[PDB]
Specification:
The structure is cut from a larger assembly and holds 2 copies of chain A. Chain A is mainly alpha-helical and about 160 residues long. Chain A has one domain: Glutathione S-transferase Yfyf (Class Pi), Chain A, domain 2 (Up-down Bundle). The first copy, chain A, has 6 helices and 2 strands, in the order ββαααααα. In chain A, strands 1-2 form a two-stranded antiparallel sheet. In chain A, α2 packs antiparallel against α3, α2 crosses α5 and α4 runs antiparallel to α5. Chains A and B meet through α1 of A and β1 of B. Chain B: Belongs to the fungal fatty acid synthetase subunit beta family. Chain B: [Alpha(6)beta(6)] hexamers of two multifunctional subunits (alpha and beta).
């Protein structure tokens, strides 16, 4: 089957079931991460420390994407799309990353810099992962318009 | 291809691209080394601490050789 990979970051932790086909690559990327990251601080409420696992994996997406190249196919594209799925399943709920950011900002501790870095790296990867946004999602108001339930105008 | 193996010794560090054919053996030899070595000290300027990566790998050669036997062919 597969081997689990723990993304344990001091106060924080998230897991990722990695097929052993690339668990070695994932473990090496972890061997890079655990060094790249700073030390656990006040529950990871620091300048960049991921105060929750969602950003713990957001920074993960950021770096991994940093280690890829879309022009080519690599070994980290697999882990890229993989952790992409796992993140959009665990922390995201079919909604948009912006809703996730707004929530994590509202309920939990808030540092706008991180919560936006979240979308930053999420998107860099989600695209670098060859998963574009050529897929219109079910935005409530927009279908409400498609059905006439609403109506919009754009002011600049 | 291969997996990189970090020979990180506190202040010092050197890497070694190991073909996964024996990256397990290399990682186990590291699991021995990191214990055999003393702790990082004044930038590894101690009695035996490798003050640079060249000696960080010299001691590595020393031990690994200690773990071989020329009369036979081994995994190391």
């Amino acid at each position: 089957s597969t081997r689990p990979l723990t993304l344990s970051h001091g106060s924080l932790e998230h897991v990722l079931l990695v097929p052993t086909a690339s668990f070695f690559i994932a473990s090496q990327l972890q061997e890079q991460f655990n060094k790249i990251l700073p030390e656990p601080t006040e529950g990871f409420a620091a300048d960049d420390e991921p105060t929750t696992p969602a950003e713990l994996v957001g920074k993960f997406l950021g770096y991994v994407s940093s280690l890829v190249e879309p022009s080519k196919v690599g070994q980290f594209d697999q882990v890229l799309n993989l952790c992409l799925t796992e993140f959009e399943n665990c922390y995201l709920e079919g909604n948009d990353i912006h809703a996730l950011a707004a929530k994590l900002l509202q309920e939990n501790d808030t540092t706008l810099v991180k919560t936006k870095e979240l979308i930053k790296n999420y998107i860099t990867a989600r695209i670098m992962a060859k998963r574009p946004f050529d897929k219109k999602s079910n935005s409530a108001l927009f279908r409400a318009v498609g059905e006439g339930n609403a109506q919009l105008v754009a002011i600049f």
